[model samples]
Target chain A: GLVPRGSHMWIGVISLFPEMFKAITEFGVTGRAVKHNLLKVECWNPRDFTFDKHKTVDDRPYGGGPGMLMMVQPLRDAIHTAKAAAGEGAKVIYLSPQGRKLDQGGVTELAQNQKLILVCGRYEGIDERLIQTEIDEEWSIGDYVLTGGELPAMTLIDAVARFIPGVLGDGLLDCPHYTRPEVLEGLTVPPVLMSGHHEEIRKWRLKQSLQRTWLRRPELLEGLALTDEQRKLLKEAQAEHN
Target chain B: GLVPRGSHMWIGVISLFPEMFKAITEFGVTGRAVKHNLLKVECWNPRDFTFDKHKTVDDRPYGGGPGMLMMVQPLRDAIHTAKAAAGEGAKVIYLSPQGRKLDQGGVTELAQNQKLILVCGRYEGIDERLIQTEIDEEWSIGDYVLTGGELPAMTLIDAVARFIPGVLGDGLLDCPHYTRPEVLEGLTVPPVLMSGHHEEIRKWRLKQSLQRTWLRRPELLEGLALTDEQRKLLKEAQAEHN
Candidate 1:
């Protein structure tokens, strides 16, 4: 479904649901890269690597809880075997809600890395020891938890791929998009967008990005360092917004 | 992959990304209902319903500054047609970040209804007037925003289906799960979870539920009434963590 088009990095994902990644690797902006060999993904299942008749991955916690905690040894052994097979020195990232919240900067960082071993913990999460001893980083896409890590992984891959040049045919930031007329139902696109002023548009985009980040994820902006222009625009926007 | 087993309330969704709903409909706890036909979903594309050659669903905002708003007439007509075809007096809900945050109460309220017409808005959300006019209710799943409203809709369905009798077999919520030794690597499931005291376990679950909610969504607990027991346990858990 994909042609690895000159991809520098190989992401080995240890997941229970590999089918979910097909869309990420097979379509949209990432799909374009895969078609041209700019991206490569190899999915690994712990169950496949397991020799047990049941191929079991979950068990009751020592103290029990509302959701199952994945077995550390099975997950650990799986990752260990994967490391041995995939070769050494590949960084492992466990997708979890408690992990570092993912953002544009995090995307850029992951994009800079050559190889990543991603562990998608299924139940409540993986065993803590596996998290402590095996995981190089705990990456969370957002605050709200999901049933699994596949979506977050896909989200990370998509966001990170943007930093890889040539992935986006147009260098557009996938910014504002519209359909139909210039104006309809008495609503019009903001004049500043159509103002055709490059400096003003840049300022507007930065301001909008900041405002959006503020509205959606204020926690991400906490302790963030801003350029002087960003600070000025953000301050003005905040003042106006409040 | 799913078939209707019996009479079911279907929420026909008009959305851009149908696959976003797959995360819930195809698998997981909610998947059982979708498979057995307890909960039904039919996704409609507004583009298909549109008469325009360009098939545009959004246009530049009249008083715009960033982001396009959904155009009227086509979307309205689409809603009207969808409502007429759905055959139930299905109340319309527009999933918007600006709407009331979704909670157990909202999910319970909707679950009792015969049918719901969930409109998943994209590209800076649907028209404000369209929402005010056609939308019977507005619900948001969480504080963080996504590319669209599909995940929220999925969550709404999942939460609501959990209340649907016979959907989750022996469903007293999901059974508490654990892995490996009773205690693993010094991090353990709460002792009360395995304490064998039924009342203790129930209290532990309620406390954990509120704790989990508060940790991720503190705003959810702000405007609500809580039983004395709930309030006390929440405070105790907070202190325990601190």
Candidate 2:
């Protein structure tokens, strides 16, 4: 069951273009989840809170640059208003490609929070000073780039939503998915998956998770702690390279 | 110029609900690309293509399990249909989490080709025999899990779109982004970016890219041959690690 409205976790978005939020709210899993009241999203456009018709949100930087840097005031005002809308005690999160990398642990941490106010910047990004004064933390989805924070924001929502209670239901991890079979086109599914041993199956899944992570994101393990079992698995993973 | 009207890419989607493509066509960067005629997306729904309307696209496995294994024939049929829709020569891509990790190189490879026929499987994925017979290649977007291939497909569109000639014009990179320094309360832009040495800036940007990639996706560089400069920079990156 979805959470009650008064109790629902609120995720407020502050941006120049609120339409960007439509990307997440109107499609796929997150959309379905939102539609079911599993999540609540509110968009606040700085332009709406701006004073002028130019209702302009950007301007030339003090030092001058090729592109305009977003003005600080409107964004600050927008953040203030959004936090107010979410009620008191909302964490202000600014989405930046340069911020701390968002990962599974980060998602889990944020999911435990009561409300999130996501600030999406444009032009040159928010006035830096404003972010310091008005934002609580910065989150980055990955190291790549995108036109705006919307996609990353959506990805974050999707990733985090899964961890929320009742979303996937307790004990049900993402329905186990597979790609092209290893043996297909001459590749085959690893023998362990078909071995029919529950213990091995569990171990295979764990090993695959870490191995895949290492092969795709080895740096993620930098400071992460590992259990004895995990350490053994990591050792096995290293062997695969040999 | 975008591809000609008759030009189409092959994307084999081995999904239960093919109409999901409608969502792709209507939203996000992919929607804009399709609307602009940059790419043609071909979808294959295994359910309808299946011989029986009992119409199941998946079946219980040889050993039995929680979820059904997608039947190879139906999925293969769907892939064939997608390829046929793509015309004489089309590259088949399976949107899975495991394949060759998706990075700039993978996106570059796909971009050089005219079209991408993406295969998105659901519920434990398709039969190894079918993938063996049909899949041409596999590409993954990140080192995380999701409910389905739908979002991963979108990631491909964004990454590959960058390589598209006109989508982002030459010399312009993604996100017209800026960070820090525009002050609302107190944060300020990072001074390094505004320091104004073009070559130094270029080096800084490259280093940031490498640094951030190392931080978020160290595995992205596994077997990659690093340029001498990159190697030296990697050493600098290691210093940062300490």
- Chain B TM-score in each of the candidates: 0.74, 0.73
Q: What tens-digit string does per-residue lDDT give for candidate 1 at A1-242?
A: 24244445567788877776775675545766677666677887777766679988776654444567666666777787667766865888988766665655667678887677888877677765566668889776544435677666766665666665555441112233334445646656567766768678777877876776566556557756778997898798899999
True contacts kept of 1: 0.17
Candidate 2 CAPRI grade: incorrect
Q: Residue A216 lDDT in model 1?
A: 54
Query: What is the C-alpha local distance difference test score of each model?
Result: 0.66, 0.64
Candidate 1, residue A29: how far the Cα is off, in Å = 2.8
**Over the stretch B185-208, how does candidate 2's per-residue lDDT look in tens digits?**
443445655777666666655666
Off by over 4 Å in 2: A1-8, A15-29, A46-74, A122-124, A170-242, B1-32, B50-62, B65-74, B123-130, B170-183, B186-242
The global Cα lDDT (0 to 1) of model 1 is: 0.66
Clashes of each: 18, 31
- Scored against the native two-chain complex, candidate 2 gets a DockQ of 0.17
lDDT of the structure predicted as candidate 2: 0.64
Give the Cα error of residue B70 in candidate 2, in Å: 4.8
